[PDB]
Design goal:
heterotrimer, A mainly alpha (about 400), B mainly alpha (about 60), C mainly alpha (about 270), A: about 400 residues, Arc Repressor Mutant, subunit A, 3-stranded antiparallel sheet, 18 helices, about 5% strand, B: about 60 residues, mainly alpha, phosphoprotein (chain B), protein folding chaperone (chain B)
């Protein structure tokens, strides 16, 4: 109990804090200075008594035979974990920022505590969600401006715990709350940026926070430029390290489900596509059966103006794209494909002339095809994939002499 | 169903990320959007039906 | 055990339930059924205020919720107020009803009457709310549930297709496909059709420098040119309707009405 007296933390305390992993036969799990008359001291001495119990109830949890019902058993742990973290909240309200990562260790193993329960009809995540919410607010408003104790360094690590919760059962407003609350906070400088937060001491959460942010921005709010930015950064801070047993990326799993969103988001916003032989791209795309064929043909369809191959690629993996929150990205990326093909009848069919007949594009009822074509081009002009103007009279498009077919870069 | 929240290792050094290695690594994003030409059955057959249009419409 | 009511008085007004329910004031389903028919007469005969039918329908909805009746009659009451509410612009009560209908379709005991009709409303309301994730989550529900008869229903396909058409500003097919909509779908689109027309008008005016006034009239389904010019007057664009006389290559002498869409660009970029 010198951790709490002299405000430091070691593996053993986090190892003690880890109630799921059983400890060795030699046991050093105790609080010294037992006098607990002070009201705030038996908080530390029932924090103790709850910590001993939970680690005991985890050999208890699998030692059982087939009984059939462990509801009370899982409810004994959830309640113990709820009131223990609720009491770590009381202690960590009034101590330095030494104790935030031990508070976060406690919070993420309570998320796995409810995660193993498969049924969501119990809605027992509300307790921990509220628990984590106050746990996210303990650090969110540290009114000590000194950075020796300021808990706002751990702000962003605690945001990823709540993101995980607001995704369990799909809730896109709760995710929308926390992206926007946090945004103003370092715009107002009340918290330090993610690159100067406690996050860069445990960089799993650095990659994760840019995923949740980029994902929310790309799949839920439809801000593609910023959903790309954060997702791209989440991949750029993943380690260049590999498991030796298999030789594939440590973090291969995380790296690939970022790129499910990153590749199509990169092509819509910035017109960027991967170098396939590049170590990081190749290391992930080639070893992912899902991405090995769709995404390379997906890129080729767009670069080449191949609308059929894009539309077939998208029709054949519609369930995949819908499940990944990619439908607007795909539906909008299709109009990039259409404009590239428009660029291709300019380069190869009009000899780069600013005035182009619309009947060139029919070669790939006819009044109706041309009206529809005028309207699809008009929409692309209007959203900045073509800088041109239309003539219904001549049935032609008049590309700008300056910078037609623009794109962000 | 499947959890990517459980990272296998919690932290690593900054020099081990891909952006700090991006001085020695090449850009992962090809930037030739404006000038990249691809050869496949489709591009070839598109040029075909297009040079046939400019012959029809000199 | 569920509460069960004895009230034999057909009519009941809606009040937000605050106390423990009074079984003398709550009506059993046979009486709720008898009042459904009275309400339906008034509606078909157009002899009741919508405010009145809506009050009666909410009271009938409240009495079902506390009696925990989830059956084919419950579905009918919610489905009927949904339809009537859309006919009277009450999108708030439509949404209240649409949500309850969808959760009641999760009950296997309750047969899916008009399941595809209300799937179509769910998509149209998510277009009004600019909620595209909901649209995608629902197509995914139909796919994972095995509902391929619904998904390849031509009308259902068109209504998802409309959602996409609006996402990418295709006014040409969105407005053509307005004519394919059923009676109450039209009612739902009209809740935001004015703004959508304005969004379409901005796309045309950013992309042409002038167009016939007949071309605007046709692409926006204005049934007359008088309804075409009044739409432009609502956007303060009446002065950009110029007149230009056409030689028609010595075919005939005639004058047509042009719209200077380049001049309209100045005015429409001020509002958005």
């Amino acid at each position: 109990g010198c951790y709490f007296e002299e405000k430091r933390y070691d593996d053993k305390l986090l190892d003690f804090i880890r109630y799921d992993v059983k400890t060795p036969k030699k046991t050093k799990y105790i609080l010294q200075r037992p006098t607990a008359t002070d009201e705030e001291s038996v908080r530390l001495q029932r924090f103790y008594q709850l910590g001993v119990d939970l680690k005991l109830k985890y050999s208890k949890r699998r030692s059982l035979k087939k009984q059939g019902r462990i509801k009370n058993a899982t409810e004994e742990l959830l309640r113990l974990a709820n009131e223990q973290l609720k009491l770590f909240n009381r202690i960590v309200e009034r101590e330095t920022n030494w104790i935030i990562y031990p508070l976060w260790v406690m919070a993420k193993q309570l998320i796995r505590l409810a995660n193993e329960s498969s049924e969501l009809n119990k809605d027992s995540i509300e307790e921990c969600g509220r628990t984590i919410h106050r746990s996210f607010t303990i650090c969110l408003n540290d009114r000590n401006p000194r950075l020796n104790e300021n808990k706002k360094i751990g702000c962003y690590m605690f945001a990823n715990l709540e993101f995980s919760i607001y995704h369990r059962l799909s809730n896109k407003d709760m995710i929308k709350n926390l992206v926007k609350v946090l945004e103003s906070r370092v715009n107002a400088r009340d918290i330090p940026p993610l690159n100067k937060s406690l996050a860069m001491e445990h960089k799993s959460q650095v990659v994760l926070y840019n995923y949740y942010l980029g994902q929310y921005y790309g799949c839920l709010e439809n801000d593609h430029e910023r959903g790309f930015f954060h997702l791209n950064e989440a991949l750029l801070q993943c380690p260049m390290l590999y498991v030796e047993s298999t030789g594939k990326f440590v973090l291969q799993g995380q790296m690939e489900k970022i790129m499910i969103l990153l590749v199509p988001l990169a092509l819509l916003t910035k017109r960027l596509y991967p170098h396939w032989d590049h170590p990081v791209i190749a290391g992930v795309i080639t070893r992912s059966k899902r991405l090995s064929q769709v995404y390379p043909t997906l890129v080729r369809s767009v670069i080449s103006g191949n609308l059929s191959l894009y539309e077939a690629t998208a029709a054949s993996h519609e369930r995949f794209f819908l499940s990944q929150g990619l439908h607007v990205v795909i539906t909008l990326l299709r109009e990039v494909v259409f404009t590239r093909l428009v660029q291709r009848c300019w380069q190869w069919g009009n000899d780069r002339k600013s005035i182009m007949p619309l009947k060139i594009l029919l070669a790939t009822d006819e009044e109706e095809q041309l009206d529809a074509l005028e309207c699809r081009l008009a929409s692309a002009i209007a959203s900045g994939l073509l800088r041109a103007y239309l003539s219904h009279s001549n049935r032609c498009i008049v590309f700008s002499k300056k910078e037609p077919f623009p794109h962000s870069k | 169903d499947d959890e990517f929240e459980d990272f296998p290792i919690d932290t690593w050094a900054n020099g081990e990320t891909i952006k700090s290695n991006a001085v020695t690594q090449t850009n992962i994003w090809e930037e030739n959007w404006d000038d990249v030409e691809v050869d496949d059955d489709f591009t070839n057959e598109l040029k075909a039906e297009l040079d046939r249009y400019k012959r029809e419409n000199q | 055990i569920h509460v069960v009511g004895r009230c034999q008085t057909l009519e009941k007004s809606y009040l937000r339930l605050t106390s423990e329910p009074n079984p003398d004031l709550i009506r059993p389903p046979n009486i709720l059924q008898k009042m459904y028919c009275l309400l339906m007469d008034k509606y078909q005969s157009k002899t009741a205020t919508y405010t009145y039918l809506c009050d009666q329908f909410k009271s009938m909805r409240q009495d079902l919720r506390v009696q925990m009746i989830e059956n084919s009659f419950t579905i009918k009451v919610y489905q009927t107020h949904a339809r009537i509410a859309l006919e009277n612009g009450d999108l708030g009560e439509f949404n209240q009803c649409q949500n309850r209908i969808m959760a009641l379709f999760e009950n296997p005991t309750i047969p899916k009457k008009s399941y595809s009709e209300f799937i179509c409303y769910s998509v149209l309301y998510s277009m009004l709310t600019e909620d595209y994730p909901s649209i995608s989550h629902l197509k995914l529900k139909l796919i994972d549930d095995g509902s391929s008869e619904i998904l390849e229903d031509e009308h259902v396909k068109m209504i998802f297709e409309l959602s996409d058409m609006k996402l990418v500003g295709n006014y040409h097919y969105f407005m053509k496909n307005y004519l394919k909509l059923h009676k109450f779908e039209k009612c739902l689109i009209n809740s935001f059709l004015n703004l959508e027309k304005l969004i379409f008008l901005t796309i045309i005016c950013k992309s042409y420098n002038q167009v016939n006034l007949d071309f605007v009239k046709s692409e926006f389904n204005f049934n007359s040119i008088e309804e075409t010019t009044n739409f432009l007057n609502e956007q303060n664009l009446t002065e950009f309707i110029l007149n230009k006389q056409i030689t028609d290559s010595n075919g005939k002498s005639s004058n047509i009405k042009i719209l200077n869409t380049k001049g309209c660009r100045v005015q429409l970029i001020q509002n958005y």
